[PDB]
Amino acid sequence: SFCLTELHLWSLKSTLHIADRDIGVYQYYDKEHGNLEEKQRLAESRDYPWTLKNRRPEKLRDSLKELEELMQSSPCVLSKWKSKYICQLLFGSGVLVSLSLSGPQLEKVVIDRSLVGKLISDTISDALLTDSFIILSFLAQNKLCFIQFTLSALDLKISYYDIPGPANRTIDRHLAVNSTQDLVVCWWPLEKDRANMLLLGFTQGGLEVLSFVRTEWSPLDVHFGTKQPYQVFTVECSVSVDKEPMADSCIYESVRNKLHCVSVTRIPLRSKAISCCRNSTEDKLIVGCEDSSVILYEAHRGVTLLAQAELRPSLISCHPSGAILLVGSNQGELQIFDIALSPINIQLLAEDYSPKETLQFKKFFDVSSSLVQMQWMAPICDLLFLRFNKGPLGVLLFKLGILTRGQLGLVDLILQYIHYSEVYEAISILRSMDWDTLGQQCLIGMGTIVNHLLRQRLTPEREAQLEASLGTFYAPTRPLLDTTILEYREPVSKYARRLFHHLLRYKRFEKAFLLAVDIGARDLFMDIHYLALDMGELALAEVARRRAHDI
């Protein structure tokens, strides 16, 4: 089982040295090459852009050239996905860029320079982009520059506000927003001058800090909740009394506009954390580690998972379906993982199948600079944004099944693993599913796995796989499952009855003996002993009849 992808790089640079026989990677052209025409014929047949047009109202080829130069002249501070096919970049020196796309393809480039003279021209550190305002942090001043919108940056109001904080020492400040205006939080690693997180109100009088806190440990990252908009979630780096690394997880709530910690959780690490990611259902925390350990924790359970990435997983991007996690690296390497942290093989499009455990971008396009950002293009969602320092920009496209209607959920991973008979992996997903939240998916995933296995000749390995699959319902780590047992018990017990009959036919005896006890059927015990009459193995003997009378 593997994912099949193709990569589109939105650049005109010849420096990428992409092989011309490689159909998996695409580049834009201006007005080594021996197979380039064949690749072009395919690209044109598919209606991909090749040579970009310059049209009077929209000089796409030339506007792209300026964008490439912007990336080289100054670092990008921010990239944001406004819509599934629309995005904006913000650059140092205040230049804003807006791109519009069709599928993986770029359609227009807009460069907006109106903001350039409006700024204090201190170094930005971080930023928040606008539906109605832009907020800029600075390294060297305790100010937020605030730009209010009502070239398209023409209807501008410019102001800035003082921020309570430490003396400026080139502070690595960061910003986050919950819902544009509703909440802003500013924070930095390290009473007001000792505090390192600020809850900012949004008012007609400008931005103000409503309250401030000092965390016990420097944050690795900060997020706002989607289901809990007034919660600020942090992951913080901490050290145990045994001097071992831990990932703290803390929830801070705004109560009467006062930000305070409400809950603390701790996860032991094999090495110090280097990255943080939260999943789309907001019930799992994924932490990258310096030693390339990947650690996952489920908030509703005491369950954690471990895996070894090859890549030193400095950046993590979770797919919005929650089914796929990607591990990026500053080294330009990408690796794909299951929610269960089972490795998934990956391939770029080619005439023959040849999956790899990891993808090295350096192998395909000779990128000259470090990878900075990965994002899934959440405003189906088969596009992953890639940005390198000083360019190139581009999008990685994932091929998704037609028969699944483009969906890539956990149910679909069960179907895909069963398609390849990767049963243990399918089981690990089934154990990753929550029966109390995903009952429909749990019944379908189990049914696929059990129906797959009962069609097979029995082997000792398969006896364990069948038992484990039913064990995910019968032997939960969570006793609170009793809340939903009445919904699932019927279809699961029907599978258990099938397992009993399947194992009896192979004269295993002991498993069928115990399954009848867990099933509790009145007559099923009667098949036990009946077989014994022709085998001599009368383990249950007459007891089958007493049990039938008691049930």
């Binding site: 598919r46 023959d352 091929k399 099944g401 149910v411 049914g447 099938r498 007559d523």
Partner: protein
């Protein structure tokens, strides 16, 4: 009701609903003994059975000594079994296929005009296997003599379909596709939304659970007569749900094709169908039985096993009406689902299809449904086969949504005929791979082919038919046809079309 239709040998064939034209065309089936008794005065001592009795078969019967001579003599020369021969009779070419088991020989002969040799080879394998499914080893079917009156019916249907396909526009489509699809190692399967798969799997699983409270041992002081092994459900000729092993699904479908039960369901509303037989499956008490119940376009097949959790059986028992009632009741509960399954047939559950006639003459979903690349849909037809799970995907009533004019209808025929030739190479590759796998316990060969395709021109346009074989641990066969204007990669189409596909 159906109880009166039960035969003395336990067989039941109950049905309730809501060949002169072939005799100008030479054809024959024969079963011969290879053990000569030249001392016998008896004529035609070699023939244990033949069909039809006609002018059409008499000419082939008169030359039967040729088949016997070649079967033993060529085998003695090459060390291998004879598989076919080709003759001209009355100026017309005829192909004859051979199958030899246990010193007996089965022969089938059909005209070349209607039946290409590779179709004939698949048909003799299909006949020998279906006869084995119904009777066990071939002698059990033929040498009994008394079975002749029903063997004649089996062969009568076989020949009628082979010589006059679709004579027994959707019906013409089925005739066009039958040449390829009926010989696949799988069954036509309909792709469904997971919501329908879960409802069907849950209802179907009740039979395997066998929760027969009304038949419990403590109520009758009796062991239940059969253990249910599994079952599979078809709607309107399409398999929709199965809990049964792949090999059993294929043998059962072959039975249903030979009695035309599935294509009959495709055209007519059947009030009731009940079939019961002893069967002889590939596995390895050793007694197994097949029960088929049909209703309102649904056909449900169940295999029952003697012994195991169940009581032993001897002789030739009739159908157990209790098991029949359980199957019928289960099938009746799916009536409320019928509007949803029909909706899936009315829509394209697969990729979007375009009509060939157009070329000579919500949106997120429609782009997700494009198997081919580009803004335009160049796909006309495809067959996708999962060789591991025994299921394949084709266009349905979508073909009627396509105009079906002089361009489109000819192009469907060209697709299936070309794909039959493509399979010949794939079958040769697969047999060689199995042989090598056993031999482990060649350069310039054309045989180990992964892809083949042909482009055609047409008029009232270029029409491209391509197929691919996958030899990896997950073997697959894929056939696609598309317009020449868009280039395609078989890997991308195979990934998109097979991804997420499981029974």
């Amino acid at each position: 009701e159906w109880l009166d239709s039960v035969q003395k040998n336990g067989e039941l064939f109950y049905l309730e609903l809501s060949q002169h034209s072939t005799l100008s065309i030479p054809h024959i089936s024969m079963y011969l003994t290879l053990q000569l008794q030249s001392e016998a005065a008896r004529e035609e001592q070699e023939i244990l059975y033949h069909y039809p009795v006609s002018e059409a078969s008499q000419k082939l019967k008169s030359v039967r000594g040729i088949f016997l001579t070649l079967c033993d003599m060529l085998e003695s020369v090459t060390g291998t079994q004879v598989t076919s021969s080709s003759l001209h009779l009355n100026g017309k070419q005829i192909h004859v296929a051979y199958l030899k088991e246990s010193d007996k020989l089965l022969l089938i002969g059909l005209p070349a005009e209607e039946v290409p040799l590779p179709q004939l080879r698949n048909m003799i394998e299909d006949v020998a296997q279906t006869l084995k499914f119904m009777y066990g080893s071939l002698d059990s079917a033929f040498c009994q003599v008394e079975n002749a009156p029903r063997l004649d019916h089996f062969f009568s249907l076989f020949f009628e379909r082979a010589l006059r396909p679709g004579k027994l526009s959707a019906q013409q489509y089925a005739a066009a596709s039958a040449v390829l699809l009926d010989n696949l190692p799988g069954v036509r399967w309909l792709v469904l939304p997971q919501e329908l798969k879960v409802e069907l799997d849950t209802a179907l699983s009740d039979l395997e659970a066998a929760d027969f409270e009304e038949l419990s041992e403590d109520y009758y002081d009796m062991r239940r007569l059969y253990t249910i092994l599994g079952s599979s459900l078809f709607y309107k000729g399409y398999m929709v749900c199965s809990h049964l092993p792949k090999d059993d699904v294929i043998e059962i479908a072959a039975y249903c094709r030979q009695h035309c039960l599935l294509p009959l369901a495709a055209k007519q509303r059947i009030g009731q169908l009940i079939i019961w037989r002893e069967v002889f499956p590939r596995h390895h008490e050793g007694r197994y039985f097949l029960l088929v119940v049909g209703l309102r376009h649904y056909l449900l097949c169940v295999l029952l096993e003697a012994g195991g959790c169940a009581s032993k059986a001897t002789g030739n028992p009739g159908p157990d009406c209790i098991y029949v009632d359980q199957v019928r009741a289960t099938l009746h509960q799916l009536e409320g689902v019928d509007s949803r399954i029909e909706e899936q047939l009315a829509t394209s559950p697969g990729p979007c299809l375009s009509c060939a006639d157009w070329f000579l003459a919500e949106l997120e979903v429609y782009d997700i449904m494009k198997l081919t690349s580009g803004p335009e849909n160049t796909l006309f037809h495809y067959v996708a086969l999962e060789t591991v799970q025994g299921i394949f995907i084709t266009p349905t009533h979508e073909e009627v949504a396509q105009l079906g004019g002089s361009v489109h209808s000819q192009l469907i025929k060209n697709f299936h005929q070309c794909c039959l030739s493509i399979r010949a190479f794939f079958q040769q590759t697969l047999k060689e791979e199995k042989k090598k796998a056993l031999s482990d316990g060649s350069v310039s060969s054309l045989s180990p082919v992964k892809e083949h395709g042909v482009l055609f021109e047409c008029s009232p346009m270029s029409y491209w038919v391509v197929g691919r074989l996958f030899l990896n641990p997950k073997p697959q066969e894929l056939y696609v046809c598309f317009h020449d204007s868009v280039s395609e990669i078989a890997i991308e189409m195979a990934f998109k079309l097979f991804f997420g596909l499981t029974l």
